[PDB]
Antibody, heavy 213, light 213 residues
């Protein structure tokens, strides 16, 4: 089965540099053209660059000529993107994808490049506490973080049903915030324990928080 | 530069509907057109290549046709998991160019939200800021009016909404409205109300709490 493991994305200041890598397995890597395709948040897919199977022809989006270099290592089955002179329009999720009979036959899960001079700030995790109730809800607020993203889990991932983790909203302060909530039987409350497992890898922060009044 | 123009740009359609999506190439790209499906916040999945061919694993309700300048993706019978943005791609010529995407929404019967309100935690008032949250759980359609009143006075701009993606089974949405006020300012007032106006409610529904009780 095709695996495409991107990494190297992260926060970088304008004019800075990042190198992305794309670790491929399960297909004859060096037989195929490889591409980077990116997507700025809220926007569509944009082709960044392609390198031929043998490494010898490279094609670049005009926007990136002279700043990005696509390259590949046959002995590590890895595709690279050395990105310099980074500007705000480079903010995007970067995917790598082989071309087989079809361009972009398979896609990695992406790596997020955020080009900003703002500083990594980690979140706070606050209960949304339950409760004449009916069968009510609870959750956690994840407030004031940068950059995107945080993951939220319930009961270390044992709680899956009726969870809604809302997309992050950018506040006036320039910081992000979101809530994850879950619905549950009113019974369950006295006996079952509810903790949200918040992770903000951009800060390596990792908060696990129980809820109720 | 070869433009790919998709129409429509979004569309709402019921389970079982036949959905067609077009894509016009700025000039003759012959049959060198592919189609991709992207669920929000996830890697694209390749659907169609060379205009009419089904990539491996993709269900047979998906199909493509077209030539030259004009291209079609059909989902013969929409399933509730098929909400996504769909992109066409020419690769007749570099730069490789995607269409702008067609967001496909699942139309379903009206579903009234379940509303909940969450006072800020003391865990947070201990911190000078205050977040009141109002949750609209599992409704359809997306459009809703969340109005915040404090001691009954409609608020402005101290509010922010976020909406989840469509549920893969029952196609509903959930929504959170966040109200932000000072520690000082939250505690100059008593009754906190968010009022919800939705197609599925005869009258607007209010959920309240007094800062005391």
């Amino acid at each position: 089965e095709v695996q495409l493991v991107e990494s190297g994305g992260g926060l970088v200041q304008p004019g800075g540099s990042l190198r992305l890598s794309c670790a491929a397995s399960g297909f004859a890597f060096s037989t195929y053209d490889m591409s980077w395709v990116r997507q700025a948040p809220g926007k569509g897919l944009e082709w960044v660059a392609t390198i031929s199977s043998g490494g010898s022809y490279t094609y670049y989006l005009d926007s990136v000529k002279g700043r990005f270099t696509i390259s590949r290592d046959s002995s590590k089955n890895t595709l690279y993107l050395q990105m310099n002179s980074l500007r705000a329009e480079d903010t995007a999720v970067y995917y790598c994808a082989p071309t087989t009979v079809v361009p972009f036959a398979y896609w990695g899960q992406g790596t997020l490049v955020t080009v900003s001079s703002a500083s990594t700030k980690g979140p706070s995790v606050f209960p949304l506490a339950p409760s004449s109730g009916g069968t009510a809800a609870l959750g956690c607020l994840v407030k004031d973080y940068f950059p995107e993203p945080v993951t939220v889990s319930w009961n270390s991932g044992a709680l899956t049903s009726g969870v809604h983790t809302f997309p992050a909203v950018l506040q006036s302060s320039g910081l992000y915030s979101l809530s994850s909530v879950v619905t549950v039987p009113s019974s369950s409350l006295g006996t079952q324990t509810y903790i949200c497992n918040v992770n903000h890898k951009p800060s390596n922060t990792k908060v696990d928080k129980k809820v109720e009044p | 530069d070869i433009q790919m123009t998709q129409s429509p740009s979004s569309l709402s359609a019921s389970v079982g509907d036949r959905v067609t999506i077009t894509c016009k190439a700025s000039q003759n790209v012959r049959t060198v057109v592919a189609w991709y499906q992207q669920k929000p916040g996830k890697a694209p999945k390749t659907l169609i290549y060379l205009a009419s061919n089904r990539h491996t694993g993709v269900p047979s309700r998906f199909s493509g046709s077209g030539s030259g300048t004009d291209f079609t993706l059909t989902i013969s019978s929409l399933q509730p998991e098929d909400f996504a943005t769909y992109f066409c791609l020419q690769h007749w010529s570099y730069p490789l160019t995607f269409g702008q995407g067609t967001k496909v929404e699942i139309k379903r019967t009206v579903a009234a939200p379940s509303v909940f309100i969450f006072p800020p935690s003391d865990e947070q008032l201990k911190s000078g800021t205050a977040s009141v949250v109002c949750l609209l759980n599992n409704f359809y359609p997306r459009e809703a009016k969340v109005q915040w009143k404090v001691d009954n006075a409609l608020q402005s701009g101290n509010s922010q909404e976020s909406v989840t993606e469509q549920d893969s089974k029952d196609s509903t949405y959930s929504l959170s409205s966040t109200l932000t006020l000072s520690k000082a300012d939250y505690e100059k007032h008593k009754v906190y109300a968010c009022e919800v106006t939705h197609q599925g409610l005869s009258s607007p529904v209010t959920k309240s709490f007094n800062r005391g009780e």
